[PDB]
Amino acid sequence: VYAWNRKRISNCVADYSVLYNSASFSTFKCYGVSPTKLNDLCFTNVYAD
Amino acid sequence: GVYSSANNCTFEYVSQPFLNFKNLREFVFKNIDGY
Ligand SMILES: *[C@@H]1O[C@H](CO)[C@@H](O)[C@H](O)[C@H]1NC(C)=O
């Protein structure tokens, strides 16, 4: 956690429904956006920490 | 020998090669609306 990895995700199609429909995640809390409309919206860059 | 460092990358794209004088290559480069 002190040296958390940051991966910049760009120039691809991000399928968020695979993550949302998984039952393997204990917490899937989204702040500032809703999971339902993630699969439609488009973003400049994604930061994965 | 064209560069010495690369620090912060935002975009990478790898594609198929584009290429008496025998060949004539014409290119047009435009910057419109961030495209
Ligand atoms: C750009 O690179 C420098 C050093 O390589 C780094 O300190 C800085 O935070 C970077 N900025 C961005 C926006 O990546």
Curated annotation (Swiss-Prot), chain A:
Changing residue 26 to F: In strain: Omicron/BA.1, Omicron/BA.2, Omicron/BA.2.12.1, Omicron/BA.2.75, Omicron/BA.4, Omicron/BA.5, Omicron/BQ.1.1, Omicron/XBB.1.5, Omicron/EG.5.1. It comes from Severe acute respiratory syndrome coronavirus 2 (2019-nCoV). Binds to host ACE2. RBD also interacts with the N-linked glycan on 'Asn-90' of ACE2. Cleavage of S generates a polybasic C-terminal sequence on S1 that binds to host Neuropilin-1 (NRP1) and Neuropilin-2 (NRP2) receptors. Interacts with host integrin alpha-5/beta-1 (ITGA5:ITGB1) and with ACE2 in complex with integrin alpha-5/beta-1 (ITGA5:ITGB1). May interact via cytoplasmic c-terminus with M protein. May interact (via N-terminus) with host bilirubin and biliverdin, thereby preventing antibody binding to the SARS-CoV-2 spike NTD via an allosteric mechanism. It comes from the Viruses. Attaches the virion to the cell membrane by interacting with host receptor, initiating the infection. The major receptor is host ACE2. When S2/S2' has been cleaved, binding to the receptor triggers direct fusion at the cell membrane. When S2/S2' has not been cleaved, binding to the receptor results in internalization of the virus by endocytosis using host TFRC and GRM2 and leading to fusion of the virion membrane with the host endosomal membrane. Alternatively, may use NRP1/NRP2 and integrin as entry receptors. The chain holds residues 350 to 398 of 1273 of the full protein. Changing residue 22 to F: In strain: Omicron/BA.2, Omicron/BA.2.12.1, Omicron/BA.2.75, Omicron/BA.4, Omicron/BA.5, Omicron/BQ.1.1, Omicron/XBB.1.5, Omicron/EG.5.1. This is Spike protein S1.
